[PDB]
RNA sequence: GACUCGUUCAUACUACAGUGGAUACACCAGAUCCCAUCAGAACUCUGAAGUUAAGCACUGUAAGGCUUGGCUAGUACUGAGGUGGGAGACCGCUCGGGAACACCAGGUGAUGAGUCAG
RNA sequence: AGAACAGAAAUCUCUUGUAGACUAAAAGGGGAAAAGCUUGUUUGAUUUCUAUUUUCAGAACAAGUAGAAAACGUGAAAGCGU
RNA sequence: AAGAUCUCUCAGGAUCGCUGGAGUUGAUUAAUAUAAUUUUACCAGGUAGAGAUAAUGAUUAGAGGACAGGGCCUUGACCUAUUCUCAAACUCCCAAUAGGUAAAAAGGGCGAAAUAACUCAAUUUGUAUUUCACUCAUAUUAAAUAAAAUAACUCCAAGUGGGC
């Protein structure tokens, strides 16, 4: 059906989005984007791994709905559904097209430069470990190179564990939802 | 004090939605009730109103009184009798919006305010 | 003060600005030596064309 | 396929953002005086006398004036050849150039110098300096105040 | 939503300070001052007339790269000296005012002896041109009696008769700028009755000019013209901010 | 102190406050005539009875905005060289040039001409 | 946010409103005391002639830009209108 | 040379381009003209980049709030501060490279005097020209550097206009 695949390992051709110009496209693969218990407070969770691009690759939509639907199964018959969050940290936007003249329409990709997280994973302390193996099993479903990392921050802010602690000790930084706010001391209360 | 809340501008409207005639009978109406000719809306004429002051408003006013609720925000107000009323108020300095060398607005601490004028129809 | 340039390559194959300055230095055959007095100007015309020369 | 008037200007002519709104009225104060060297900026609040896309931060010799035009002499490159092209344009666009102050101040700066150091006698290099080498000199750094660095390990 | 999201006051431009305060037209100001570009040095000066509340304001301005130059300039308080002491706004008044002004500016030059101008109401002059200045040149308005009193006076500034009163008559323009309506007027409303009379025209009453009297007192004074022309600091709010911080905490 | 013409065209804006009115601005008083309307609201004209309430001026605000400066960052990017590396994708080195947003700190005006009033 | 019939729309009013409207028609530019909308007066959508720009051979047509000699149109006037 | 414009034109032709010869003019005075160059001035830019909390279009999430359906509550819409990722035909901002103009003697200075039917209010108010004056670097040359005049320019004509 799909074209076999190794063709789209290259990234050239310039980018062409989903747009006003070209009209048409069929749907990407992937619309289900975040997983896992969504709705929990940045206090509860603390630890993070990302799986991380180094090649350029394009990434097939059907491709990251795959490696996504993959790593949260692995979570969910290892941890459960209570203890973390899968947020898919990509997107396709951009066209393919192919012959039976110009082409017309026929999927949509995802072109990452290096050195940007794919999948990340929120979670607890005891399953980060974990967390990386659900990670290492979805490479598996990706074009071209990729190394799993672990962080020094909280998960989901820019700031280091211990920055974290050390402004909540404070009281200068207020959940506000999926992560935290930092109070920056402007106009009346 | 000078900061004195007044009628600035009395508006009545008459509408039949339609065609002459009855458009023209609620004009005549409209002029009999107080001198001053109508004028008169689109093409999609429709409708009819005209405006007032003064002596002549505070007369169309007092026989308009033979409710809390439904005085705006901006501290203004109508009612319902057939026809309909609009009282625009305000303190003086109005001027200062229209006048054509140096348009421009009003302080917020000099706009009339709801609260104000609901206390005014009361008092009056 | 003053740098010694010599040329270090061939005729064939040059741009056209790399053999416009060389003209303007002076080294046109391929081991040629010439003095040049250091400024501003003489530095970045020998930049221009510093893949080509040694000097000192 | 088609190349007419305004052809491929989309940003060139376009203003800057919160440069929108009528040309200035001081601007039509300034002086131009035949052979005086102008600028030529296009302009869009303005439509009458807009020029042609070349001629778009182009600047040459004043050679005519009319009531609201003023003609400039212009270099266009033609293949193997500049000529010289007559762009009548009207004085929104039109800009008193720069280039030629300069020079201007210079002569001026080097008159007074070159009548002070004649008087005296004293000979002089009023030619323009066209920054040397640097010189040898000597340099008092405190023993205590260097700094010594390394290249960072990698993270 | 909110109109004034932060995202409005970025975008936004705002019109000329004189624009904005509402002073300026602009418009009207870039096609006044431009002279044909092949000429040189020709200024052509404006005759600037500003009608404020209490009088009107009557400058010779010329447009230079850093700012109007004016070059004469007169207020109607100063026909009090010429002993006319009350009707400051009045379009006689303007009248007057521009008259002054166009003698006084001939008499910097020393071209008062060099152009006497016309006698009473009805080589070449110097040349201006009549501003507008942002008030509707209506039929009638105060802008042209000041226009008038300038010409009368000497100088050339080019016009039509169209807006002085009627679409024309002379003698009704004559009668106006002698001021007769206005004493109509006053005749009139002491007619009507003796409580407005002195009510409105109170200052008059207590200078002691008769309605009779006006044009006699104008008409005097006109000849007379003609012969004889604090910031606080960032380590200051800091601590500002400090001390209110400690007593709100405390206050409430 | 104030005004008239302007200049730069947000450090000049906006939003909310406070503070100021000798003379001045203004609001404000009135409709006979010129004038203008649906309406003296505007505009026009004619006043000078009142008033800082507003306009206006001045200042304030951990203000928004705007504006300098740091810092982002020698990061991103890039001209020239390379019988350099890499299977490829791409990535170093040599001679050079070199950002942006965010963030943080400061700032919130200056001024030409003419005039009136102690 | 208010005002008989009156509702999501009808008209009227006040507040907020830098353009989110409208500008004959593609799409992009430009425009708020206007280029928009409303109103008044009009016919310069005129005759004659240059210098020229665009494409380009620096030929042509065509479309313009800047003028000049006439005669006028409008505006109080500068101006603006080929 | 395989460019270019026009061609019932695409295997052609014309006409430009690029080439030779002939000639004059100019240089022949380490020079001025001049230069596929840099310099110092001075501009003009909207591409890589960068941005989404700057506008337009995309676009994933939750948090805190005062209008629609049902029984304090639920689904919301709707706001407000946020958040994940984005655009050849999006743009607050924005490189490098490339491009233009500038760098004095047939000129420029500061003066005088003339001339005109133009200009201006101005027979002197300017303009512009013209004529006289006075005087600007030059013993490295109004920034370098230059087998920089082997240059200009005219004529007559070729071949070429499939390219890679």
């Given at each position: 059906?799909?074209?076999?695949?190794?063709?789209?390992?290259?990234?050239?051709?310039?980018?062409?989005?989903?747009?006003?110009?070209?009209?048409?496209?069929?749907?990407?693969?992937?619309?289900?984007?975040?997983?896992?218990?969504?709705?929990?407070?940045?206090?509860?969770?603390?630890?993070?791994?990302?799986?991380?691009?180094?090649?350029?690759?394009?990434?097939?939509?059907?491709?990251?709905?795959?490696?996504?639907?993959?790593?949260?199964?692995?979570?969910?018959?290892?941890?459960?559904?209570?203890?973390?969050?899968?947020?898919?940290?990509?997107?396709?936007?951009?066209?393919?097209?192919?012959?039976?003249?110009?082409?017309?329409?026929?999927?949509?990709?995802?072109?990452?430069?290096?050195?940007?997280?794919?999948?990340?994973?929120?979670?607890?302390?005891?399953?980060?470990?974990?967390?990386?193996?659900?990670?290492?099993?979805?490479?598996?479903?990706?074009?071209?190179?990729?190394?799993?990392?672990?962080?020094?921050?909280?998960?989901?802010?820019?700031?280091?564990?211990?920055?974290?602690?050390?402004?909540?000790?404070?009281?200068?930084?207020?959940?506000?939802?999926?992560?935290?706010?930092?109070?920056?001391?402007?106009?009346?209360? | 004090?000078?900061?004195?809340?007044?009628?600035?501008?009395?508006?009545?409207?008459?509408?039949?939605?339609?065609?002459?005639?009855?458009?023209?009978?609620?004009?005549?109406?409209?002029?009999?009730?107080?001198?001053?000719?109508?004028?008169?809306?689109?093409?999609?004429?429709?409708?009819?109103?005209?405006?007032?002051?003064?002596?002549?408003?505070?007369?169309?006013?007092?026989?308009?009184?033979?409710?809390?609720?439904?005085?705006?925000?901006?501290?203004?107000?109508?009612?319902?009798?057939?026809?309909?009323?609009?009282?625009?108020?305000?303190?003086?300095?109005?001027?200062?919006?229209?006048?054509?060398?140096?348009?421009?607005?009003?302080?917020?601490?000099?706009?009339?305010?709801?609260?104000?004028?609901?206390?005014?129809?009361?008092?009056? | 003060?003053?740098?010694?340039?010599?040329?270090?390559?061939?005729?064939?194959?040059?741009?056209?600005?790399?053999?416009?300055?060389?003209?303007?230095?002076?080294?046109?055959?391929?081991?040629?030596?010439?003095?040049?007095?250091?400024?501003?100007?003489?530095?970045?015309?020998?930049?221009?064309?510093?893949?080509?020369?040694?000097?000192? | 396929?088609?190349?007419?008037?305004?052809?491929?200007?989309?940003?060139?002519?376009?203003?800057?953002?919160?440069?929108?709104?009528?040309?200035?009225?001081?601007?039509?104060?300034?002086?131009?005086?035949?052979?005086?060297?102008?600028?030529?900026?296009?302009?869009?609040?303005?439509?009458?006398?807009?020029?042609?896309?070349?001629?778009?931060?182009?600047?040459?010799?004043?050679?005519?004036?009319?009531?609201?035009?003023?003609?400039?002499?212009?270099?266009?490159?033609?293949?193997?050849?500049?000529?010289?092209?007559?762009?009548?344009?009207?004085?929104?666009?039109?800009?008193?150039?720069?280039?030629?102050?300069?020079?201007?101040?210079?002569?001026?700066?080097?008159?007074?110098?070159?009548?002070?150091?004649?008087?005296?006698?004293?000979?002089?290099?009023?030619?323009?300096?066209?920054?040397?080498?640097?010189?040898?000199?000597?340099?008092?750094?405190?023993?205590?105040?260097?700094?010594?660095?390394?290249?960072?390990?990698?993270? | 939503?909110?109109?004034?999201?932060?995202?409005?006051?970025?975008?936004?431009?705002?019109?000329?300070?004189?624009?904005?305060?509402?002073?300026?037209?602009?418009?009207?100001?870039?096609?006044?001052?431009?002279?044909?570009?092949?000429?040189?040095?020709?200024?052509?000066?404006?005759?600037?007339?500003?009608?404020?509340?209490?009088?009107?304001?009557?400058?010779?301005?010329?447009?230079?790269?850093?700012?109007?130059?004016?070059?004469?300039?007169?207020?109607?308080?100063?026909?009090?000296?010429?002993?006319?002491?009350?009707?400051?706004?009045?379009?006689?008044?303007?009248?007057?005012?521009?008259?002054?002004?166009?003698?006084?500016?001939?008499?910097?030059?020393?071209?008062?002896?060099?152009?006497?101008?016309?006698?009473?109401?009805?080589?070449?002059?110097?040349?201006?041109?009549?501003?507008?200045?942002?008030?509707?040149?209506?039929?009638?308005?105060?802008?042209?009696?000041?226009?008038?009193?300038?010409?009368?006076?000497?100088?050339?500034?080019?016009?039509?008769?169209?807006?002085?009163?009627?679409?024309?008559?002379?003698?009704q323009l004559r009668k106006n700028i002698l001021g007769i309506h206005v004493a109509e007027y006053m005749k009139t409303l002491q007619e009507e009755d003796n409580d407005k009379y002195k009510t409105h025209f109170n200052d008059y009453l207590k200078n002691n000019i008769g309605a009779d009297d006006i044009e006699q007192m104008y008409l005097n004074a006109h000849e007379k013209i003609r012969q004889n022309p604090k910031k606080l600091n960032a380590k200051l709010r800091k601590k500002r901010?400090?001390?209110?911080?400690?007593?709100?905490?405390?206050?409430?």
């Amino acid at each position: 059906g799909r074209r076999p695949a190794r063709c789209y390992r290259y990234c050239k051709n310039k980018p062409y989005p989903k747009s006003r110009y070209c009209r048409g496209v069929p749907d990407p693969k992937i619309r289900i984007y975040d997983m896992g218990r969504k709705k929990a407070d940045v206090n509860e969770f603390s630890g993070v791994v990302h799986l991380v691009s180094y090649e350029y690759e394009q990434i097939s939509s059907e491709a990251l709905e795959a490696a996504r639907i993959s790593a949260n199964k692995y979570m969910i018959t290892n941890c459960g559904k209570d203890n973390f969050h899968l947020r898919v940290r990509i997107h396709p936007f951009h066209v393919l097209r192919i012959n039976k003249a110009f082409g017309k329409p026929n999927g949509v990709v995802a072109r990452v430069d290096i050195g940007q997280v794919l999948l990340s994973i929120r979670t607890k302390e005891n399953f980060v470990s974990k967390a990386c193996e659900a990670l290492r099993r979805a490479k598996y479903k990706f074009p071209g190179r990729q190394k799993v990392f672990v962080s020094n921050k909280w998960g989901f802010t820019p700031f280091s564990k211990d920055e974290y602690q050390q402004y909540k000790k404070k009281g200068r930084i207020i959940s506000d939802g999926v992560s935290c706010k930092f109070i920056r001391e402007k106009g009346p209360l | 004090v000078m900061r004195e809340i007044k009628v600035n501008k009395l508006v009545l409207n008459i509408c039949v939605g339609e065609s002459g005639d009855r458009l023209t009978r609620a004009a005549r109406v409209l002029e009999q009730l107080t001198e001053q000719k109508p004028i008169f809306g689109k093409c999609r004429k429709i409708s009819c109103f005209v405006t007032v002051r003064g002596k002549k408003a505070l007369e169309i006013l007092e026989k308009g009184l033979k409710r809390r609720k439904n005085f705006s925000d901006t501290g203004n107000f109508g009612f319902g009798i057939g026809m309909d009323f609009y009282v625009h108020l305000s303190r003086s300095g109005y001027r200062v919006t229209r006048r054509t060398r140096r348009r421009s607005k009003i302080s917020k601490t000099h706009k009339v305010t709801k609260e104000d004028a609901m206390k005014w129809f009361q008092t009056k | 003060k003053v740098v010694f340039v010599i040329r270090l390559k061939g005729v064939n194959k040059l741009p056209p600005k790399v053999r416009s300055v060389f003209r303007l230095l002076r080294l046109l055959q391929v081991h040629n030596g010439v003095f040049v007095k250091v400024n501003k100007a003489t530095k970045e015309m020998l930049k221009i064309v510093e893949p080509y020369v040694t000097y000192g | 396929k088609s190349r007419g008037k305004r052809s491929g200007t989309r940003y060139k002519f376009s203003k800057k953002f919160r440069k929108h709104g009528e040309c200035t009225a001081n601007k039509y104060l300034e002086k131009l005086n035949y052979g005086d060297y102008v600028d030529i900026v296009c302009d869009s609040t303005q439509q009458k006398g807009m020029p042609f896309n070349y001629y778009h931060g182009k600047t040459g010799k004043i050679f005519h004036i009319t009531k609201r035009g003023v003609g400039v002499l212009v270099n266009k490159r033609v293949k193997h050849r500049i000529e010289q092209k007559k762009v009548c344009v009207r004085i929104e666009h039109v800009r008193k150039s720069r280039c030629n102050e300069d020079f201007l101040l210079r002569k001026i700066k080097n008159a007074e110098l070159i009548k002070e150091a004649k008087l005296k006698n004293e000979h002089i290099n009023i030619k323009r300096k066209t920054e040397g080498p640097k010189p040898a000199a000597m340099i008092k750094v405190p023993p205590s105040k260097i700094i010594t660095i390394e290249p960072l390990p990698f993270y | 939503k909110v109109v004034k999201n932060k995202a409005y006051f970025k975008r936004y431009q705002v019109k000329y300070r004189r624009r904005r305060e509402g002073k300026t037209d602009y418009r009207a100001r870039k096609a006044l001052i431009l002279q044909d570009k092949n000429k040189y040095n020709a200024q052509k000066l404006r005759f600037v007339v500003r009608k404020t509340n209490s009088q009107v304001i009557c400058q010779i301005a010329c447009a230079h790269i850093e700012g109007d130059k004016i070059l004469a300039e007169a207020k109607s308080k100063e026909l009090i000296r010429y002993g006319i002491p009350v009707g400051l706004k009045n379009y006689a008044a303007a009248y007057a005012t521009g008259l002054l002004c166009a003698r006084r500016f001939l008499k910097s030059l020393n071209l008062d002896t060099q152009f006497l101008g016309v006698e009473k109401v009805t080589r070449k002059p110097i040349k201006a041109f009549l501003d507008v200045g942002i008030t509707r040149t209506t039929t009638g308005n105060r802008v042209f009696a000041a226009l008038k009193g300038a010409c009368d006076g000497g100088l050339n500034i080019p016009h039509g008769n169209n807006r002085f009163p009627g679409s024309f008559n002379p003698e009704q323009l004559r009668k106006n700028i002698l001021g007769i309506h206005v004493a109509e007027y006053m005749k009139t409303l002491q007619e009507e009755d003796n409580d407005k009379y002195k009510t409105h025209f109170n200052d008059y009453l207590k200078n002691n000019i008769g309605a009779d009297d006006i044009e006699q007192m104008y008409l005097n004074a006109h000849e007379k013209i003609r012969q004889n022309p604090k910031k606080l600091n960032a380590k200051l709010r800091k601590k500002r901010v400090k001390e209110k911080l400690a007593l709100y905490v405390e206050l409430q």
